[PDB]
Amino acid sequence: MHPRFQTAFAQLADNLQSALEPILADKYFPALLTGEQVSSLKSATGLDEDALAFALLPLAAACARTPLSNFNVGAIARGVSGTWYFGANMEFIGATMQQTVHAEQSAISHAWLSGEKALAAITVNYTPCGHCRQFMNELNSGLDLRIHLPGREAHALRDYLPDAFGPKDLEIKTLLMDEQDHGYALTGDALSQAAIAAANRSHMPYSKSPSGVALECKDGRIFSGSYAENAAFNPTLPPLQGALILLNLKGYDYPDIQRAVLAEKADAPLIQWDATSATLKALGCHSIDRVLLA
Template identity: 35%
Template sequence: MASATFKVQHNTALSNSHISLNVAQTQALRSQLKTQRGILYSSDIKALCTELNVSEDILLQGLVPMASEFSVAPISKFHVGAIVKGLDSQGNTTFYFGANAEFDHQALSLVVHGEQSAINNAWLNGSKKILKIAISDVPCGYCRQFMNELADAKELDILLPAQNFKLAELLPHSFGPTDLGNEHSLFNPAEQTNCFENKQLDEKLMSYALAAYVPYSQNYSAVKISTFENGDFYGSYAENAAYSPSLSPLQSAVSQLFLAGLSFDKQTVKSVTLLETAGHENQSGVAKAVLASFTGLPTLEVISATLAK
């Protein structure tokens, strides 16, 4: 991954230029992103903008090639990077990185798209609003549909290398949550008043399950990936009105693992646990299918727990 310089590309109406990071700057930023699990906080962004003398949006688009470096694409060899510009709980601008992830010898429908990865990163890490998303390539229809589940989806700015769009321009006459009678969205969920009856469960895993966006199946579910040396990674189930672009909790968690620069293998992963809502289970088959793509991983632990209202 080392290079003499890292070209930070940006385009404006008046120019098409680049800014170069030297080897030390590039390596430091890569290391920082892995440590922070694919997130650049407000202070990081301000420091980089000052150092490079660029605006936030130019930096956002310029760093997309670095997001692509987190891609795991053994099938397509097509590396997609995406960065969400969002607001954290304090209203500060934060960059959430994402990249596509593919799984050998499994249905192509199990892949994680770059846009999904970035949005999932923002959602899991407490972003309250997505302002823009910068992407290395034009989003496919699947990703446009996934983005349509966001609050303010129609006004979402999509920044591409050659041209910028509103999501509504790329997805006219769309089908979304309200067509299924759902007045909520991925970043504007219904108030959670439930809890799991089994209090002996991992509290953090339960919190991620209860934070799942599951207006269509009601399967509040989450996955915990425990590693030997790098802590735990969590993922929540995120559904979509079109159903197919839904992101499973295992896909969600694996994407987080990859954004830390880690490999999903037996040398790294100690255990994988799936928590589902009793009576609404629908994720164990998908999780087992993804895990079957890898050799020597621990057996999936599946927990079905009852919700108390």
């Protein structure tokens, strides 16, 4: 068990602890549960999906990186595949408030970057902020996505965001998590190729500026992040954050990053380079390169 899960696990119900102890054994438990694992968990406890998701939220919140607030939020995104993806909020000392990752964005990005094609529901241990409701309205699930919160009854996103602004208002038909491939040729080494592959999956219908970041860890692990625009612009997930969401959920920590690469167009209306390098230097990484698409 990775040390982060240790207090949360200790507080779980006995039959849940038992069913989970095999799964959580590995330090690099991927903060995700396949359909099969969810079925076993249900057989061992008698919990249904929603109640299981709620019971598990302490483990998702245990992945939160909150040096400023000490307010840990956990979210579980439930893929249409049946896979459940954890997500937790992250705050970065030395950067800005605009670089913060919310638990809900972490869980959705985990699912999208893992290749999930659509989400069925999202379970969170605290009500989502307007920034997250706006982020969720970018998805191909639109206003129908169901949110599950402790003590409340389920609701579609349209109930949490009445008279919603979204891609339709800007006449955009390509929604986040729809299949996208921008056809940039992968060149360079492993890390730049991973960054370009991430840029190829970019959701960028508003500025048409593709970008992706890939981080290489001490042990050779590469974590990649694709850029995801939002119709309201500011809730956009920058490329670096995707990679850091993955690095953290998968059990690693910022001192394990060795190199990082950002791929983006040279003549692009929006440029990620400055915010990427500045946040990475804040986290300690200083080996940052940029490969540019054409």
